[PDB]
UniProtKB/Swiss-Prot annotation:
Binding site for hydrogencarbonate 1: T117, R121, A123, G124
Record's protein name: Serotransferrin
Primary localization: secreted
Native source organism of the sequence: Homo sapiens (Human)
Record text about domains: Has a bilobed structure, each lobe binds a single Fe(3+) ion. Does not always bind 2 Fe(3+) ions. (Microbial infection) Binds to Neisseria transferrin-binding proteins A and B via its C-terminal lobe only. The L3 helix finger of TbpA inserts into the C-terminal lobe of TF, altering its conformation and probably disturbing the coordination of iron 2. Electron microscopy suggests that in the TbpA-TbpB-TF complex, TF is captured directly above the loop domain of TbpA in a chamber of about 1000 Angstroms(3) formed by the 3 proteins, where interactions between the proteins serve to abstract iron 2 from TF. Binding to TbpB does not alter the conformation of the C-terminal lobe.
Localization per record: Secreted
Name of the gene this protein is made from: TF
């Protein structure tokens, strides 16, 4: 079909007509076409697409947020990168360069000297002041005046010093051009180097452009949003905001996003960077930056799950909203706003609601459709916390959330203190054939508690993905039983069960669970994937069943990842990976509050005296493990500022990640697109 692009000037409108003409040529008779709808401005192109009069346009961050707001409600469908297919550089980072050991944190700039790249610029002002908005003295309008009282002097190019002198103190006159060496990225940075100002709100690339030698940067460092500093080389881990450089948008519903991609893509390949000589898609013969930015290297599809909020990022959004809405809480103090939990089900909403009233307002509830939606919500700001299993802890991590409290299941006189890292997913094989290794495990017979399990599938299959390469996880083992397959695979054809319960993920199956898989080994099975607590539990006659009558633990041996072999005695050093417990996650900030609020709450309705029924019990569920596993003794503190990686272990993260190449999830790729 034909895509109606939208230009905002006659020049840009001409270039669109060449794009239409040049396509009807190098594009098959039935390929992506491109019509041209010119308008007066960006906001008009936006509204036109909203009205289905236009199909798409390319906008900067600012206007991207503008296209999201109703009634427009548009979303990002295609981005432009400025590097290689390895180093896309689709975004840029608004940072705040400072001096080593300066002595201050973002949350305490009050009474400082700042260097902005120029008033009204994004990285240099909108974003920095947007963030510091409520930290300014009332009235907050005019804006220039308020920022003056905050920053005890500074350099704000293009700002009217005549009415508010404080902003041109470091650079009198506030020269809005190069005539002023403290104007711009380079200039604002020079305003810090020269020692004039304390902080230089600039871009991530700024310091690397005004300083070649590395030993030079060391004296400089970034200011992070969680009141911390870090090396200017680590901006991706410490930036005031992440903003998309240039984005193609379309109606969120019926915006023809796929068709827009089929055009842009099939176009960057015909007339893309240096591609053709007949037409330079990213070049403007008449003027600069038309339809696409001149410096664009190509296009990149945006994951469909992505929407403007998630795309711009929490920092960005919060900053621009302050700027445009201007709304701050009356009584600050930071008494920790109620924690918004996320229910992903009716019964979960109910249990959460009961929890709410019994929290005296400390806890609030939010309802999202899916575990992934909640996660998006905890990123957005719409939700604050929630518990997730290892698989989703990983996904929340890649999305920027963090683990704060891990659900503990064992009991002691100090459950909250000592954290639990979970059991171990080991690989057991009959020591009858001493020649089997993690490597020659291919083409043999396996045993899986059930496809989709942590210990009997995810971990092993994920750690073994390298050999498999392709997503044909069954075509790796000659046979074996893994309940849950297509009921006829190489792994399902070795499972008993009736004509219906044949190879099924339930008790009605024989080789199901941690016991069934061990059985599968005692029979038609070379390798069996289970947990450390399965061997000395299904042997010694501890199982009065026919097969496990009294098998011997000593006759089985554990396989280690490095390649060697070891007994079930010291599995600790011969396990595939460690399966974690569920853990509550939250946005980086809010961490202290969640950590705090969830403690008191745990003392009031936790695993206290068996006084439920007549009182609310936070770890008991109407139906089954609702907001929390019903076997959660307490919410242990992760002590160290555990991050999804430090909390899952390297083995675990590797497993899940590989496995995610076959079992995609909309949320995960969207977050990855923003941070690979």
């Amino acid at each position: 079909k034909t895509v109606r692009w939208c230009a905002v000037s006659e020049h840009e409108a001409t270039k669109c007509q060449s794009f239409r003409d040049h396509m009807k040529s190098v594009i098959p008779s039935d390929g992506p076409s491109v019509a041209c709808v010119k308008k007066a401005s960006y906001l008009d192109c936006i509204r036109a697409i909203a009205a289905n009069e236009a199909d798409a346009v390319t906008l900067d961050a600012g206007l991207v947020y503008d296209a999201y707001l109703a009634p427009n409600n548009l979303k990002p469908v295609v981005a432009e990168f400025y590097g290689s297919k390895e180093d896309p550089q689709t975004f840029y980072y608004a940072v705040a360069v400072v001096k080593k050991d300066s002595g201050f944190q973002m949350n305490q700039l009050r009474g400082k000297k700042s260097c902005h790249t120029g008033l009204g610029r994004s990285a240099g002002w909108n974003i920095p002041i947007g963030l510091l908005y409520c930290d300014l003295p009332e009235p907050r309008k005019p804006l220039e005046k308020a920022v003056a009282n905050f920053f005890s002097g500074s350099c704000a190019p293009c700002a009217d010093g005549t009415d508010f002198p404080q902003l041109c103190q470091l650079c009198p006159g506030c020269g809005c051009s190069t005539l002023n060496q403290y104007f711009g990225y380079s200039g604002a940075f020079k305003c810090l180097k020269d020692g004039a100002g304390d902080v230089a709100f600039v871009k991530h690339s700024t310091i690397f452009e005004n300083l070649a030698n590395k030993a030079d940067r060391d004296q400089y460092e970034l200011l992070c949003l969680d009141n911390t500093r870090k090396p200017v080389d680590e901006y991706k881990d410490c930036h005031l905001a992440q903003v998309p450089s240039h984005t193609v948008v379309a109606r969120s519903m019926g915006g023809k996003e796929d068709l827009i991609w089929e055009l842009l893509n099939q176009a960057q390949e015909h007339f893309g960077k240096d591609k053709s000589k007949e037409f330079q898609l990213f070049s403007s013969p008449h003027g600069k930056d038309l339809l696409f930015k001149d410096s664009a290297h190509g296009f990149l599809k945006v994951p469909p799950r992505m929407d403007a909020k998630m795309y711009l990022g929490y920092e960005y959004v919060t900053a621009i909203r302050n700027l445009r809405e201007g709304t701050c809480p009356e009584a600050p103090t930071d008494e920790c706003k109620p924690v918004k939990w996320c229910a992903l089900s009716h019964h979960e909403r109910l249990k959460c609601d009961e929890w709410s009233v019994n929290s005296v307002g400390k806890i609030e509830c939010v309802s999202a459709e899916t575990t992934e939606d909640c996660i998006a919500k905890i990123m957005n700001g719409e939700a604050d916390a929630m518990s997730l299993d290892g698989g989703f802890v990983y996904i929340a991590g890649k999305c920027g959330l963090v683990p704060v409290l891990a659900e503990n299941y064992d009991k002691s006189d100090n459950c909250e203190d000592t954290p639990e890292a979970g059991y171990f997913a080991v690989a057991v094989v009959k020591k009858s054939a001493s020649d089997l290794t993690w490597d020659n495990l291919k083409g043999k017979k396996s045993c899986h508690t059930a496809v989709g399990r942590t210990a009997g599938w995810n971990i092993p299959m994920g750690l073994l993905y390298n050999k498999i390469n392709h997503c044909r996880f069954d075509e790796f083992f000659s046979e074996g039983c893994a309940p849950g397959s297509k009921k006829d695979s190489s792994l399902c054809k070795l499972c008993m069960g009736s004509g219906l319960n044949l190879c099924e993920p339930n008790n009605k199956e024989g080789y199901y669970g941690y016991t069934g898989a061990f059985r599968c080994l005692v029979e038609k099975g070379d390798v069996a994937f289970v947990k450390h607590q399965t061997v000395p539990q299904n042997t010694g006659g501890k199982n009065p069943d026919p097969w496990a009558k009294n098998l011997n633990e000593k006759d089985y041996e554990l396989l280690c990842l490095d390649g060697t072999r070891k007994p079930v005695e010291e599995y600790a050093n011969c396990h595939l990976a460690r399966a974690p417990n569920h853990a509550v996650v939250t946005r980086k900030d809010k961490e202290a509050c969640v950590h705090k609020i969830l403690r008191q709450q745990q003392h009031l309705f936790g695993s206290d005296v068996t006084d439920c029924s007549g009182n609310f019990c936070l770890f008991r569920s109407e139906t089954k493990d609702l907001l929390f596993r019903d076997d959660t003794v307490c919410l242990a503190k992760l002590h160290d500022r555990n991050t999804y990686e430090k909390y899952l272990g390297e083995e675990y993260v590797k497993a899940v990640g590989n496995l995610r190449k076959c079992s995609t999830s909309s949320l995960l790729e969207a977050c990855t697109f923003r941070r690979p």
